[PDB]
Paper text:
Many of these proteins, including E. coli KefC and KefB, are glutathione (GSH)-gated K+ efflux systems that are usually maintained in a closed state.
In this report, we present the structure of the KTN-bearing C-terminal domain of E. coli KefC (KefC-CTD) in complex with KefF, resolved to 2.4 Å resolution. In order to stabilize the KefC-CTD/KefF complex for structural analysis, fusion of the two domains via a flexible 12-residue synthetic linker was pursued. Crystals contain one dimer of the fusion complex within the asymmetric unit. Unexpectedly, the structure reveals that KefF has a novel zinc binding site not found in the other quinone reductase enzymes with which it shares homology. A binding pocket for GSH between this arm and the rest of the KTN domain suggests that the arm can either be stabilized in the obstructive conformation by a smaller GSH molecule or possibly destabilized by bulkier GSH adducts, modifying in turn the protein interaction interface's potential ability to associate with parts of the membrane domain, which might lead to activation of K+ efflux.
Numbering used by the authors:
A (entry chain A): 400 to 562, 1001 to 1174
B (entry chain B): 400 to 577, 1001 to 1174
The structure:
């Protein structure tokens, strides 16, 4: 049905087994009879053939497939496949393996968005392990790898080339969202709203601080929009705060990037207001305290929260009632600023 | 001074380049003349020649180094160097590139702890991109890759314990695919002063188990079953961490979201934590006046999301332990507060 995989050695095998674990249907071509053999032994069925033959690709279902995984090792063959596919199967999304930088560059120029250098992440992981056995903590080693990865990709993208409302959205599952999605649909029908969805930008929890601080600089209203999770916020939003509100950008000497900007907490909850009469300091507004303190410390003005309660039990029309009041609040804020 | 890298091609150059940024001092063995100029550019000492030569290895400082990175591509050569080092330089920690699962298994059998299959994490990123373009969210896709990584490593670990033929391995593949607990969540445990002393104290008691989340899950891929198993044995659960923006570390929040599952911790039914106790043990830079901020001021208010979480899951919330003033702290206050932490734990178990 949806995926063709060209090459089913070390690289292709892993990519295909991940997709199988998600119940994705695929057809696999390999031109190595020994690899096909070893795979038969482990219950994987792979078809024999050179994937640069458009007749083979065509019978594998290329005209109807969504994604082709180019996992061929040889740069020139890998590149031939790429060019042939975009000429004969232009609807087909190409995801490609790259042997090295030279190969990655040729793939970028061919129009592949994100070529994966075959040894890059493994070599990065090896570096982390070496740092660890030298005594760095595992987490700090991983942050250093994240910093190097961002620098190296930017460098390599450059080589390839050479040849106001800011909503910080922090739903972990934006595609599964009912309440927050409706809120965003409504907020989009204003100008000039920018939305930064953290879990789409940073699935590996590697905040790009410079990019985030740049967006915040162009914002007059910042919004923390998220579903409530355990009387609190999602892990990535907490990470965003800890990293982006840096010394001395958000606080200290000096430190004043956020001064005079406003902040709004826009939160959705499963339970209704009565669900929060628990513990030593009951009530919904008490839950804002860490966030409000955070904002005030960094020189932000804290607006009264937008809270959409009772998303568990409802009419599927307060989902749009309360969603419109969200837009109302944003529009209100800006007609005054 | 500290690191030897054997092989400086695509794999060795990335690894060595990461280490430069960390100011690590290294020496490199490599037998390709096309890399000599790249090594010179970085100012790195190179021994040109076959890295399996005992003389080059000795010249490179093998007897003195802490770490050897085996970034040789050819599996036999890689394995040869590994055995050489295991035999003659037993102090030397080996980090090894593995070509594939067969090479990985043989390195494991040779005593290498975590060989890194060279294409594995990259093939996993490619699979994630495939899933995204088929409509999965990036994050949900990353989580699927975490589940797959965990099971894959477990599977390959069991294949390593059996004989080196495909039939023996394919058989294993087919069969397999068919009391105080301190939850410590400082992101930088080695840089800790206050929490480190707290743990130094707590470790003098028994039976205390410590799970350092940032040592265990630097990639924020929580093993829910392992965490739930450890909780099953605990009578007192401690969330121990430094305060970060009036709240908790991101990884502790992920641990709650993931480990307090439906219905293990709440729902039907849903009662695994019922009857257990919870202590919040937190450290703060500021003193009590530091919390005179916002509409609901005062340190105590801040325990609210934690207390409500605990109550909801049927845990028994204890008065928090807090160590304030770490910003400007007499080591006698730090010594004194660490001891009081131990005191509090001891008094809980004398009571239970
Ligand atoms: O590194 P690797 O282990 O991932 O091997 C690359 C794989 O790609 C396959 N391959 C190379 N060229 C191919 C082509 N033209 N068509 C189909 N498969 C090909 C090889 O047979 C090999 O199995
Ligand atoms: O894939 P790769 O690009 O990472 O290259 C492997 C590297 O290891 C080096 N290498 C292979 N065998 C070696 C040996 N025996 N001694 C020193 N260097 C070696 C090669 O020169 C090559 O640079
Ligand atoms: C991990 C988890 C923890 C949650 N904790 C709370 C809670 O503390 N209080 C609450 O009212 N809702 C809680 N919820 C429910 C969500 O807030 C609710 O489903 C969400 O706001 C719905 O918005 P959505 O349609 O955009 O997903 C939790 C949900 C999950 C996934
Ligand atoms: C990102 C970050 C946020 C912090 N937020 C607070 C805070 O809200 N209140 C406070 O008193 N200290 C805060 N601190 C200080 C730490 O709580 C304090 O340095 C830590 O508890 C010291 O313990 P340690 O020696 O174990 O690292 C913060 C520190 C960092 C790194
Ligand atoms: Mg392949
Ligand atoms: Zn999603
Ligand atoms: Zn550390």
């Amino acid at each position: 049905m949806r995926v063709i995989i060209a090459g089913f050695g070390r690289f292709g095998q892993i990519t295909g087994r991940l997709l199988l674990s998600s119940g994705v249907k695929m057809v696999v071509l390999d031109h190595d009879p020994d690899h096909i053999e070893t795979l038969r032994k482990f219950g994987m069925k792979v078809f024999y053939g050179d994937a640069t033959r458009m007749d083979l690709l065509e019978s594998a279902g290329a005209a109807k497939a969504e994604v082709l995984i180019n996992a061929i090792d040889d740069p020139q063959t890998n590149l031939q496949l790429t060019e042939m596919v975009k000429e004969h199967f232009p609807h087909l999304q190409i995801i490609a393996r790259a042997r090295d930088v030279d190969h990655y560059i040729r793939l970028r120029q061919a129009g592949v968005e994100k070529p994966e250098r075959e040894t890059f992440e493994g070599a990065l992981k090896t570096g982390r392990l070496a740092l660890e056995s030298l005594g760095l903590g595992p987490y700090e080693a991983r942050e250093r790898a994240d910093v190097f990865r961002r620098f190296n990709i930017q460098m390599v993208e450059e080589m390839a080339m050479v040849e106001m409302i800011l909503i910080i959205y922090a739903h972990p599952y934006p595609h599964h969202s009912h309440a927050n999605k409706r809120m965003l649909e409504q907020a989009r029908t204003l100008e000039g709203v920018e939305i930064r969805s953290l879990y789409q930008l940073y699935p590996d929890f590697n905040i790009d601080i410079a990019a985030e601080q740049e967006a915040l600089s162009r914002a007059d209203l910042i919004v923390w929009q998220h579903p409530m999770q355990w009387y609190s916020i999602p892990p990535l939003l907490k990470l965003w705060i800890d990293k982006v509100f840096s010394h001395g950008w958000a606080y200290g000497h000096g430190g004043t990037a956020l001064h005079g900007k406003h902040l709004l907490w826009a939160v959705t909850t499963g339970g209704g207001e009565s669900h929060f009469e628990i513990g030593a300091h009951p009530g919904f507004d008490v839950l804002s305290q860490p966030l409000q303190a955070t904002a005030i410390y960094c020189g932000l003005n804290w607006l009264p929260p937008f809270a959409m309660h009772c998303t568990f039990i409802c009419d599927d029309e307060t989902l749009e009632g309360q969603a419109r009041h969200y837009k109302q609040r944003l529009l209100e804020w800006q007609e005054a600023h």
